[PDB]
C-alpha cells in the first residue's frame, strides 16, 4: 500500500488476508475504492459481496467500481468515483488487483481535479510512489482528456440544489 497524499488518498493492489486489510487500517485507511472485477475479486475472496461485507466489517466504507483490467472508468463511473473521493478527504484507499494501472489512473485523475496538475505531473507523481502506475495508450488518454475537461468534471461533480 502507498500514499500519493500522506494520509488522505492512496493506493494498492488485492488483499489476500484480512490481517493484511488490518494492516490498512493502522495505516490510516478509512474508505476503500474497489476497482477489480468480480471474478478478480473471486480469486483471492471467493465471492465479491463476501469481500465487501469483509471490508465494511473491519471498520472501511467500500464502494465498488468494476473497471476492466487494462481499462478506464465510462464517465458516469468517473463522476461517481468523484463524488465519492471528494465527499471525504482523509484516509482513502484506492485498489485493483496488481495496484498499477487502473489505479494509478484514478490517483493521477484525482490529483489533476483536485490540484489542477497538468497531466504529465499527475502521472509522474504516482510513478513515483508507485513505478508503472498507469499502463495502458488508453488510460494515458483519459488522464489528457481529464485535464482538458476539469473545469466539466467539476461542474458536473458539484451539480446540487
Not at 29 to 42: Q, T
Not at 69 to 84: A, C, R
Request: with cysteine; net charge negative.
Amino acid at each position: 500500500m502507498y500514499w500519493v497524499r500522506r494520509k488522505t488518498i492512496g493506493g494498492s493492489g488485492l488483499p489476500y488476508t484480512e490481517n493484511e486489510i488490518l494492516e490498512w487500517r493502522k495505516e490510516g485507511v478509512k474508505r476503500v475504492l474497489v476497482l477489480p472485477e468480480d471474478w478478480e475479486i473471486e480469486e483471492s475472496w471467493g465471492d465479491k459481496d463476501y469481500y465487501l461485507s469483509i471490508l465494511k466489517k473491519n471498520g472501511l466504507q467500500p464502494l465498488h467500481i468494476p473497471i476492466p483490467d487494462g481499462g478506464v472508468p465510462s464517465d458516469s463511473q468517473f463522476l461517481t468515483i468523484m463524488k465519492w473521493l471528494l465527499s471525504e478527504k482523509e484516509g482513502n484507499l484506492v485498489h485493483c488487483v496488481g495496484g498499477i494501472g487502473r489505479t494509478g489512473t484514478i490517483l493521477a485523475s484525482y490529483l489533476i481535479l483536485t490540484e489542477g496538475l497538468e497531466v504529465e505531473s499527475a502521472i509522474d507523481e504516482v510513478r513515483l510512489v508507485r513505478p508503472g502506475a498507469v499502463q495502458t495508450y488508453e488510460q494515458e488518454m483519459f488522464l489528457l482528456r481529464v485535464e482538458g475537461m476539469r473545469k466539466s468534471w467539476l461542474k458536473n461533480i458539484y451539480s446540487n440544489s
